[PDB]
């Protein structure tokens, strides 16, 4: 009955893992050679990554 006015802190811990961002057009694993890696295949085009 005498609870103080409180504020909620939310967080997560996700250990042991790597934040995977797949270079696929729907972020799914439809194969090891993804569909966005085959559009750049035989392209002979260098792209900057920032």
Partner 1 sequence: DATDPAVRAALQSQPSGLNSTDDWRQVMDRIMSLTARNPDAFRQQPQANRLSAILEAVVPARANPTHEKVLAIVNALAENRAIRPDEAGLVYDALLQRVARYNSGNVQTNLDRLVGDVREAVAQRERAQQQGNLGSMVALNAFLSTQPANVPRGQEDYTNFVSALRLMVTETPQSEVYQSGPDYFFQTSRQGLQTVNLSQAFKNLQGLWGVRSLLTPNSRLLLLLIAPFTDSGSVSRDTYLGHLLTLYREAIGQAHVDEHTFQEITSVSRALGQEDTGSLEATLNYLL
In angstroms, rounded to a whole number, what is the distance separating the alpha carbons of residues 26 and 36? 10
Q: Least distance to partner 1 from the beta carbon of 41, Å?
A: 9
Q: Which member of 4, 7, 18, 43 binds partner 1 (CB under 8 A)?
A: 43
In angstroms, rounded to a whole number, what is the distance separating the alpha carbons of residues 38 and 25? 11
* Residue 34, burial from CB neighbour count under 10 angstroms (0-12, 13-18, 19+): middle
Q: Which member of 44, 46, 49, 50 binds partner 1 (CB under 8 A)?
A: 44
Q: Which member of 2, 8, 10, 42 binds partner 1 (CB under 8 A)?
A: 42
Footprint of partner 1 (CB under 8 A): 42-44
């Amino acid at each position: 009955k005498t609870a103080v006015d409180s504020i909620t802190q939310k967080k997560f811990l996700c250990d042991r893992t790597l934040w995977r961002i797949p270079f696929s057009s729907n972020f799914m694993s439809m194969g090891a050679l993804t569909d966005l890696g085959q559009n750049l295949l035989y392209a002979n085009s260098a792209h900057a990554l920032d």
